[PDB]
Design a protein around this ligand. Structure first.
Ligand SMILES: [Zn+2]
Ligand SMILES: [Zn+2]
Lengths: 98, 178, 46, 361, 88, 49
């Protein structure tokens, strides 16, 4: 979680369409955050492993990345765009119980 | 019973068949009142003040007129344009006069909480305070569409006679009161 | 008359009696437990 | 009916392992034994959609499949539950039935996809602003709104309204004042729970005072969050303004937010006049914010008293002495022609008709 | 979930619905025997009013057990989840 | 469209979350990069004691 994720992201930093040159998209930094649950109102609250055990849920934390890309102009930036979610091993660095 | 306020008519819509071919370019060339902007639309639009109305004419020989406060006034304006076209050099006739629509409005002089109306009438009342400020209600007897606002004023449309407007008004009035 | 479920976190009695989604009335918790039965049960002390 | 005694008291019952149908009045067995698949085949189960098994999913036009793929993408990038996406695509397919929409231009179908997702989201009570969905599309607000009205009129389906509390709960977490980010001084950080409580009771006050009806809720929610944020610490926060807070919060406040603020100040003045301490202290627009908790502790009776002096739009509260004056009766039409001189203006003499062809050329 | 259906003779629930509480779920602390229902679940037939059919959760087991606790919860998509703990 | 599109509109989120949860839950790891299919990687924790 701490280093290899960033190494992979660096290994795949840049993407560019062969059609219409001068357009591209670059990744800058990627984080993993803390575990949480998506309730039914586009809002989140933190969880504990036992609540996940009871509710047949998954104990995971969101993956977030900051991005740099172009649309007409190149000066478009996003800072905390999420990509997905990663399961969390218990008593790891990002867990609640540590 | 009535609240002492009658629905006043605001608009009248009527049409009549002129019964002949006309040249819009000729009308724009001769009449002291005409459009012809074929780049946008190929038609001629009239208007007079006695009655206060606007009419629109085509080469196909149809007339559409609107703007009066009473149906008879609309017919008077229609006959005035018929006279104008007859003296324009066209063999116009005032044939098949038909009344299409009218608009009216009224008030109840007490505030209206739209939330209760939508909660009890959603099946025919559409409430959406994001785009259109007011509330939309479509009535079946007669085929009337109604707009309601918090101020208590109501707009009525879709009828053919003032009797329909009055009757729809008194149909809805108990609902407006409670 | 309406039935009571005990919240799993603050243990404040809640009544649902509806399709209302589960959520505590005081705290934000989302787990509820049924109350114990009122009928008596007989055991053999063996 | 039991074939032996004719009684209708048949009961389904199983002995230790044998399922059977027994006449509970004479003991006869009318049907015994079942044939059921086991695990050895349970592991092999496949699935075929019946539409596929019936030849459907083959008449789907390229544009129709593209549109439903757009529906899936829109539904899924928002991380909505799968049932939402399934219902959305079902409604899209159902609306595709009529000829009037399958014959339509691309932006019309785009905004139809958007409003389809929007309505299915409404059906689940889920709060979601139309502006955000317009942002996720390539369309403008006006055409989207017009087409949404057209489709709701066409289908006449149920459209549950947006519950204000749900908008408040969704919107409150969006702001970034709950974390000690380096971009914001820690002076402004507050517990979010008290924030939500203060805001939802403030917007309840706004709602019951006729402020919210017929107006955009978002600016009202923003103003309520304002009154909270100043109320929890007037010691320093009273000096800030709208632009400052929206800057730190990184939010685009609506223009009518200031007017909504002003009118809710009018309301809290009307609300403060009742209280003894406030009405003696001679408070003002700015100074009142520090007593918000005091007023809302006893809201209901005081607002009921304030009703007996309601709220109506200020524009028509200018004391109109005349209301809907009766116009004069002018339905008379004359006999056949009230005049002939009006026609004596509608024609041009040849003097200028001749030269009517050489300026527009 | 439907409440227990009462007997036409005894003013009391039928034997299969002996332990169910007034809402259709067992009451913690009771003793459950073989073939008695745990939840009185009914499902619509959509697969003018829609017909239902009954698929109650019958307790299968050779020996009696005691209900210790019952937990009710829900997910984001309105799927009510019910769990029960049984003791021997 | 002549007007330039923006990629943010298409940034999907299922194909990572579902990939990870499936790969961990079912226990099979299929990788087209090296043509390796591994089975039995994960086991349910045992709570007999
Ligand atoms: Zn609780
Ligand atoms: Zn028999």
């Amino acid at each position: 979680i701490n280093v290899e994720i960033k190494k992979i992201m660096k290994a795949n930093e840049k993407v560019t369409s062969d059609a219409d040159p001068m357009w591209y998209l670059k990744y800058l930094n990627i984080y993993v955050g803390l575990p949480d649950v998506e309730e039914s109102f586009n809002v989140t609250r933190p969880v504990s492993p036992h609540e996940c055990r009871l509710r047949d849920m998954t104990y995971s934390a969101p993956i977030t990345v900051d991005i740099e890309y172009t649309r007409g102009s190149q000066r478009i930036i996003r800072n905390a765009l999420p990509i997905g979610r990663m399961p969390i091993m218990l008593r790891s660095s990002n867990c609640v119980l540590t | 019973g009535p609240s002492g306020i009658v629905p006043q008519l605001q608009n009248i819509v009527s049409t009549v068949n002129l019964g002949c071919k006309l040249d819009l370019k000729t009308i724009a060339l001769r009449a002291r009142n005409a459009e012809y902007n074929p780049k946008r639309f190929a038609a001629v639009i009239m208007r007079i003040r006695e009655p206060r109305t606007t009419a629109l004419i085509f080469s196909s020989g149809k007339m559409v007129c609107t703007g009066a406060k009473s149906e008879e006034q609309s017919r008077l304006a229609a006959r005035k344009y018929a006279r104008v076209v007859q003296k324009l050099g066209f063999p116009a006739k005032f044939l098949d006069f038909k009344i299409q629509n009218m608009v009216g409005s009224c008030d109840v002089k007490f505030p209206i909480r739209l939330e209760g109306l939508v909660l009890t009438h959603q099946q025919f009342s559409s409430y959406e305070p994001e785009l259109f400020p007011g509330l939309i209600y479509r009535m079946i007897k007669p085929r009337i569409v109604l707009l309601i606002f918090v101020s208590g004023k109501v707009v009525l449309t879709g009828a053919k006679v003032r009797a329909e407007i009055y009757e729809a008004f008194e149909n809805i009035y108990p609902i407006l009161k409670g | 008359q309406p039935m009571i479920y005990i919240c799993g976190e603050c243990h404040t009695e809640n009544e649902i009696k509806s399709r209302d989604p589960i959520r505590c009335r005081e705290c934000g918790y989302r787990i509820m437990y049924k109350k114990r039965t009122k009928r008596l049960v007989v055991f053999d002390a063996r | 009916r039991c074939p032996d005694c004719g009684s209708t008291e048949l009961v389904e019952d199983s002995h230790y392992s044998q399922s059977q149908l027994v006449c509970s009045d004479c003991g006869c067995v009318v049907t015994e034994g079942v044939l059921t698949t086991t695990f050895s085949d349970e592991g092999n189960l496949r699935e075929v959609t019946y539409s596929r098994s019936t030849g459907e999913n083959e008449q789907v036009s390229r544009s129709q499949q593209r549109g439903l793929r757009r529906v899936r993408d829109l539904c899924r990038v928002l991380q909505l539950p799968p049932t939402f996406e399934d219902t959305a695509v079902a409604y899209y397919q159902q609306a595709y039935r009529h000829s009037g929409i399958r014959a339509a231009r691309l932006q019309k179908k785009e905004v139809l996809v958007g409003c389809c997702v929007l309505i299915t989201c409404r059906q689940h009570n889920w709060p979601l602003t139309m502006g955000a969905i317009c942002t996720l599309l390539y369309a403008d607000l006006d055409v989207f709104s017009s087409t949404y009205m057209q489709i709701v009129k066409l289908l006449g389906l149920d459209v549950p309204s947006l519950c204000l509390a749900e908008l408040v709960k969704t919107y409150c977490s969006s702001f970034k004042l709950f974390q000690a980010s380096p971009s914001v001084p820690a002076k402004y950080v507050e517990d979010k729970e008290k924030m939500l409580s203060r805001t939802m009771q403030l917007v309840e006050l706004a709602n019951e005072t006729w402020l919210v009806t017929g107006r955009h809720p978002l600016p009202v929610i923003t103003a309520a969050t304002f009154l909270a944020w100043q109320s929890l610490q007037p010691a320093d926060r009273l000096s800030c303004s709208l632009a400052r807070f929206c800057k730190l919060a990184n939010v685009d406040l609506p223009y009518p937010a200031s007017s909504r603020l002003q009118e809710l100040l009018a309301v809290l003045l009307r609300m403060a006049e009742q209280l003894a301490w406030l009405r003696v202290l001679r408070l003002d627009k700015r100074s009142v914010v520090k007593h918000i908790g005091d007023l809302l502790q006893h809201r209901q009776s005081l607002v009921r008293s304030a009703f007996r002096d309601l709220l109506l739009p200020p524009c028509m509260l200018k004391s109109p002495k005349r209301i809907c004056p009766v116009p004069p009766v002018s339905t008379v039409t004359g006999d056949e022609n009230i005049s002939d001189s009006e026609i004596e203006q509608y024609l041009r003499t040849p003097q200028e008709v001749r030269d009517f062809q050489r300026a527009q050329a | 979930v439907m409440g227990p259906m009462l007997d036409a003779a005894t003013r009391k629930p039928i034997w299969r619905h002996e332990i169910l509480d007034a809402d259709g779920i067992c009451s913690p602390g009771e003793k459950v025997e073989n073939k008695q229902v745990l939840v009185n679940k009914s499902m619509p037939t959509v697969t003018q009013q829609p017909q239902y059919k009954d698929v109650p959760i019958t307790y299968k087991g050779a020996t009696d057990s005691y209900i210790e606790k019952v937990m009710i919860s829900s997910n984001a998509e309105d799927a009510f989840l019910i769990k029960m703990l049984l003791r021997q | 469209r002549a007007a330039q599109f923006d990629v943010v509109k298409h940034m999907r989120q299922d194909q990572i979350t579902n990939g990870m949860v499936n790969a961990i839950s079912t226990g099979n790891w299929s990788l087209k990069r090296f043509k390796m299919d591994r089975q039995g990687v994960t086991q349910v924790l045992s709570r007999l004691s």
